[PDB]
Amino acid sequence: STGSATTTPIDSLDDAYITPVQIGTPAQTLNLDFDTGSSDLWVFSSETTASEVXQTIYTPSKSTTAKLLSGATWSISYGDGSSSSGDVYTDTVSVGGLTVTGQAVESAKKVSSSFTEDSTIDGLLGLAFSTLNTVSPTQQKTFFDNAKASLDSPVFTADLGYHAPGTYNFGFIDTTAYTGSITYTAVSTKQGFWEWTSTGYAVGSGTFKSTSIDGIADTGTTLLYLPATVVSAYWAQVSGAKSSSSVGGYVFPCSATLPSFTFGVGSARIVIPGDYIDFGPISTGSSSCFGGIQSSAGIGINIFGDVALKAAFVVFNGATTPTLGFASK
């Protein structure tokens, strides 16, 4: 089997992407944030504290296939400090025509303020390794782990657009969606992430420096977070850019034409166009814009977030020994 779903940016900044997911029988359609940085599928629901709901909710009691997973609970917090918790049902879940029976659907009893305030995200679908799932006492498998037995090939691909829709495919590689060939690189699963090592970087039309950069491929993070000295090297080429303590990172004049940024995948090179690094104005009508490449020093891990992934066709190869593939597009 295979599945193919359109994913759409939630706003004009590409802050996040949402993908429709059908849950239950008859299907309830929710728009979820596919996150390769976590492993929980959780949704707003009829159980969520009413004052914290502003979103489309899942109602397990209107699904004939929903089953309560007795005595299971979950609690998660994310790197930006947001959190949620609740109980667990199993139910039928379909993405793009690909159906999984018996999927753990984590129902939120409580959600943090950030979740309440974002009307466009009805929940998260985690696509990291199942060791990071937060259900207790027995962890639950991710949608991808449950689908692998049925998939034509144990892969999914991410084709995120720049201020445009893109596609998540399950079970096949669309050879029309990229150019050249795919280069694969080893994944370390020790921390539960799609963790890989980039072979170097270049800024604009300058030299490529071979330097290993360990980081994670994370669809659920907006920006590109890299070591402080790499990031300083990038913004040194932008005459009006400065690190702003009040805004929380590097800012630059919106009128600037930004240099591209290249990262290494083995012997291959992926080029992020300068325009992708212009995240946007710090506020409407401002003359100052926020940068899309920022320092990872405060995070503790380098993150190849949407700014980087949307410049590439990305293959998450879910075989027993996983790998990550990148192609230009």
Residues binding ligand 0QS (CB under 6 A)? 15-16, 33, 35, 37-38, 76-80, 82, 118, 124, 132, 134, 218, 220-223, 299
Nearer to ligand 0QS, 77 or 181 (CB): 77
Is there a catalytic annotation at residue 122? no
Q: Kindly tell me which of 83 and 323 has the beta carbon lying closer to ligand 0QS.
A: 83
**64 exposure class (CB count in 10 Å sphere: 0-12, 13-18, 19+):** exposed
Task: Give the pair of three-digit tokens for residue 199.
Answer: 């072979």
3-state secondary structure of 75: strand
Which residue lies nearer to ligand 0QS by CB, 26 or 117?
117
Name residue 126's beta-bridge partners: 35
In the complex, the smallest distance separating the C-beta of residue 83 from ligand 0QS, rounded to whole angstroms, is 9
Report the distance separating Cα 291 and Cα 101, nearest Å: 42
Tokens of 320: 């027993």
Closest CA to 235 of 256, 255, 263: 256
Shortest distance in whole angstroms from residue 131 CB to ligand 0QS:
9
**Which CB sits closer to ligand 0QS, 98 or 224?**
224
Q: Which is nearer to ligand 0QS, 24 or 220 (CB)?
A: 220
Breaks (C-N over 2.5 A) in the chain follow: none
Tell me the closest approach of the beta carbon of residue 283 to ligand 0QS, in angstroms.
Answer: 12
Q: Is 35 a catalytic residue?
A: yes
Instruction: Collect all residues with Cβ–Cβ distance below 8 Å to 70 and sequence separation of at least 6.
Output: none
Exactly one of 14, 33, 35, 40 is catalytic; name it: 35
Taking the CB of residue 255, how many other CB atoms lie within 10 A of it? 8
Comparing CA positions, the residue from 269, 275, 278 lying closest to residue 328 is 269
Residue 8: exposure state from Cβ atoms within 10 A (0-12, 13-18, ≥19): middle
CA dist 24 and 102 (Å) reads 10
Q: Which residue has the tokens 């040194």?
A: 236
Annotated active-site residue in 84, 94, 198, 295: 198
**In the complex, which residue's CB is closest to ligand 0QS?**
37
Q: How far is the CB of 58 from ligand 0QS (least distance, A)?
A: 17
Pair 221, 280: CB distance under 8 Å: no
- Please report how close the Cβ of residue 251 comes to ligand 0QS at its closest, in angstroms: 13
Nearer to ligand 0QS, 151 or 223 (CB): 223
- The least distance separating ligand 0QS from the CB of residue 124, rounded to whole angstroms, comes to 6
Catalytic residues, by residue number, are 35, 198
